[PDB]
């Protein structure tokens, strides 16, 4: 259901069953018992419920907000423009928080899946999380509990002044 591009899953490499002993593997019998006593009734119930859902098929939509002029293109006391820009900035802040959440989910999934080789096999995920975390900390950090778009603008201006000072040295 979820876009596999957003949440990448490596191809599943499952070893084939190659028993060498002649003893009856209790795991196989237990799995068959489970599939007979739980899976079948659960699947039948899900089939019934999915039929009922398909009988009454309705839709819900993802609301899309158009881009609005930022706080940079906003007069000193233009309360209307400032309100629009502040709402857009808060929406962007929420979206960036969710982006960081997605990256963290990727990192956790990689850490669990790779088992004992997570340190070497999740370097790419660690790098992606480091990049996103540094970007987020540069943008949304130290603002405080009363953060506003004007405060990010001020922090960005301070950072750009520091960059200019470094470049001129």
């Amino acid at each position: 259901s979820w876009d596999k591009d957003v949440y990448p899953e490596p191809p599943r490499r499952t070893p084939a069953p190659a028993p060498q002993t002649s003893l009856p593997n209790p795991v196989t019998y237990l799995t068959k018992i489970f599939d007979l006593l739980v899976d079948r009734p659960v699947t039948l119930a899900r089939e019934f419920i999915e039929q009922q859902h398909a009988k009454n098929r309705y839709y819900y939509y993802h609301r899309e907000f158009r881009r609005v002029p930022d706080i940079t293109e906003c007069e000193e006391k233009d309360i209307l423009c400032m309100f629009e820009a502040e709402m857009q900035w808060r929406r962007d802040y929420k979206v960036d928080q969710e982006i960081v959440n997605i990256i963290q989910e990727r990192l956790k999934a990689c850490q669990q899946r790779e088992g004992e080789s997570y340190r070497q096999n999740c370097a790419k995920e660690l790098e992606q999380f480091t990049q996103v975390s540094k970007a987020f900390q540069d943008r949304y950090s130290d603002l405080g509990a009363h953060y506003s778009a004007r405060k990010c603008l001020a922090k960005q201006k301070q950072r750009m002044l520091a960059e200019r000072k470094a470049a001129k040295e």
């Binding site: 940079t72 906003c74 007069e75 000193e76 130290d142 405080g144 004007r150 001020a154 922090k155 201006k157």
Partner: protein
Amino acid sequence: TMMSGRPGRVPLQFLPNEARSLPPPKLTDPRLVYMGFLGYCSGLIDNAIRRRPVVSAGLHRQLLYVTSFVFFGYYLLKRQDYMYALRDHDMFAYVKSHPEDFPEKDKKTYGEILEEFHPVR
């Protein structure tokens, strides 16, 4: 004393004739309703003081309380609206006649203004 010395002000006049150019307060005004509520409370306290049934005794007296309070409140609100309109009119006229004292300021957007960022660590 501000409005006391305004030119053309007729002494001891509650409502000047120029006030009629303003819309009268609506009879459903919340302020007028509160004046009626004050009148009703006055009637209830009058009943309570004279030791008679507070909510039932003397309906005519409570009605008179409410009517008088609403009447005086309506005239009072009309005068108040007139005085505030006078204040706004005089302020606008003074601003218009003194452009130097109220000059338009350069409109610099936040992208241009440099406001210092104070971190919260």
